[PDB]
């Protein structure tokens, strides 16, 4: 079987660990959302080719610039993401994450991801954001950033509805095989 390494990067509380949880288990936790997601190998098949995708979480290390790179060696694809309900997390994609991901992982495909798409139409988050003089992230903004950084593609999903989850890892596995 083919072995590929996926490292998911991005701001904390932007949904990283949850996305991995939902994908690897194909079911959104209801009561308690796990905090820990240790290195796990998921069996996925794309283009009729069996792949063993190693999933590496980075939750908990966003604030340490010298411990963070320790995860980048031999990465086949990078799932760089932000939270749909946080135009702030998106601003870091080009300001923080991209410059870094490109320096330690040159020529490694990047899949920009917008987590928590379901909160785009959520009035509660729309309200809270307003107070901060902000509004959910619009798809148009995502694709723009995706091309601005030179991603291998833009994508959105929801950990709650599992909507788009499979699609993200399926698309990233493909970019890895290239």
């Amino acid at each position: 079987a083919i072995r590929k390494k996926l490292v998911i990067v991005g701001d904390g509380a932007c949904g990283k660990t949850c996305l991995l949880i939902v994908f690897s288990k194909d079911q959104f936790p209801e009561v308690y959302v796990p905090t820990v997601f240790e290195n796990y190998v998921a069996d996925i098949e794309v283009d009729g080719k069996q792949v063993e995708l190693a999933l590496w979480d980075t939750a908990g290390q966003e604030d340490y610039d010298r411990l963070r790179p320790l995860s980048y060696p031999d990465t086949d694809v990078i799932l760089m993401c932000f939270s749909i309900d946080s135009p702030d997390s998106l601003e870091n994609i080009p300001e923080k994450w991209t410059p870094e991901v490109k320096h330690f992982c040159p020529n490694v495909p990047i899949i920009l991801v917008g987590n928590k798409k379901d909160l785009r139409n959520d009035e509660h988050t729309r309200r809270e954001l307003a107070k901060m003089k902000q509004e959910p992230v619009k798809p148009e903004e995502g694709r723009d950033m995706a091309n601005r950084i030179g991603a291998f593609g833009y994508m959105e999903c929801s950990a709650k509805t599992k909507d788009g989850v499979r699609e993200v890892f399926e698309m990233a596995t493909r970019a890895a095989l290239q």
Partner: protein
């Protein structure tokens, strides 16, 4: 009721804490025997050279030391809190010293990373992996201590969120801060060991308090960087502030991380500080000798400015209480 559900959530966090802890201990042992110990196994000697065998300590660092701590002490103490999950904060508090062993591991990790790059294709590992029946290579396991130490704050933060009204909410907040502090210290030391060209010992400079890259302007008195700022990486020490120039390094992985060429050094006994600067709330000045030498630091954010200002003042305050 609410008190009801929060205690349920405190239960969940305590469970993940204990489960992941047991797994962490298992996984380390798994590698310490299935790879490290196998290096001294005659039946395998035909798959490993003498050079690699000697580099065993570079490859594993002090993983064993770490494993004994968690296996003999920490997991045992976490379990004693299965009953009162809000009190897990006290376990970390009574072991903050023992956690210092993680600094040695992280500092050596890049050395191991470089080695692994040269010896991964070695027959020995491919064989140990097969025996162990692991879909993952030794590299995924060698990062676990780093991944684990950086999950404790997340877990403590989760416990604290569900314990606002418990008799341990304070010890939790303290433990959280203590771990965050150890993580910052370890991360700072990573930058420190990358400094090059330092004429002397860094140890007798006192504790490293802060480090960071800034745009720096000068505004000295009398016999460059007056208009076009220079890019320096600073290291705030109890005894002095070091100015370094980021030197770009090339290589495969962590080798890409830059090094820091030592430039100058301001002795704290002569350092003074200007907190507020006209026109920019993000600037602050670190001056030297009666202000005959002024450095304007461009803090990327308010939080960073505040941290640096605060650290400088604590040091300047101690100097005072010590100079008399």
């Amino acid at each position: 009721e609410e008190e009801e559900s929060l205690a349920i959530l405190r239960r969940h966090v305590m469970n993940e804490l204990l489960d992941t802890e047991r797994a962490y201990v298992e996984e380390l042992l798994c590698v310490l025997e299935g790879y490290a110990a196998e290096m001294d196994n005659p039946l395998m000697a035909h798959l490993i050279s003498t050079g690699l065998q000697n580099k065993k300590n570079i490859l594993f660092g002090n993983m064993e030391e770490i494993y004994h701590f968690h296996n003999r002490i920490f997991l045992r103490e976490l379990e004693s809190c299965i009953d009162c999950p809000e009190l897990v904060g006290r376990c970390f508090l009574e072991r903050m010293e023992e956690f210092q062993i993680y600094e040695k591991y992280c500092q050596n990790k890049p050395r191991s990373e470089s080695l692994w790059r040269q010896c991964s294709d070695c027959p020995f590992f491919q064989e140990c992996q097969k025996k162990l029946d692991h879909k993952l290579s030794l590299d995924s396991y060698l990062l676990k201590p780093v991944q684990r130490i950086t999950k404790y704050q997340l877990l403590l933060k989760e416990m604290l969120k569900y314990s606002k009204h418990c008799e341990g909410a304070e010890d939790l907040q303290e433990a959280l801060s203590s771990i965050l502090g150890i993580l910052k210290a370890v991360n700072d030391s990573m930058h420190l060991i990358a400094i090059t060209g330092y004429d002397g010992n860094l140890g007798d400079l006192g504790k490293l308090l802060m480090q960071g890259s800034f745009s720096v302007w000068t505004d000295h008195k009398k016999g460059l960087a007056r208009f076009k700022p220079m890019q320096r990486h600073l290291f705030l020490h109890e005894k002095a502030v070091l100015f370094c120039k980021k030197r770009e390094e090339n290589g495969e992985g962590y080798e890409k991380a830059p090094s820091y060429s030592y430039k100058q050094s301001l002795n704290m006994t002569a350092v003074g500080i200007t907190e507020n600067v006209k026109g920019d709330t993000k600037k602050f000045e670190i001056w030297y000798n009666a202000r005959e030498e002024v450095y304007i630091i461009q803090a990327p954010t308010p939080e960073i400015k505040a941290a640096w200002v605060n650290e400088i003042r604590k040091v300047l305050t101690s100097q005072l209480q010590a100079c008399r």
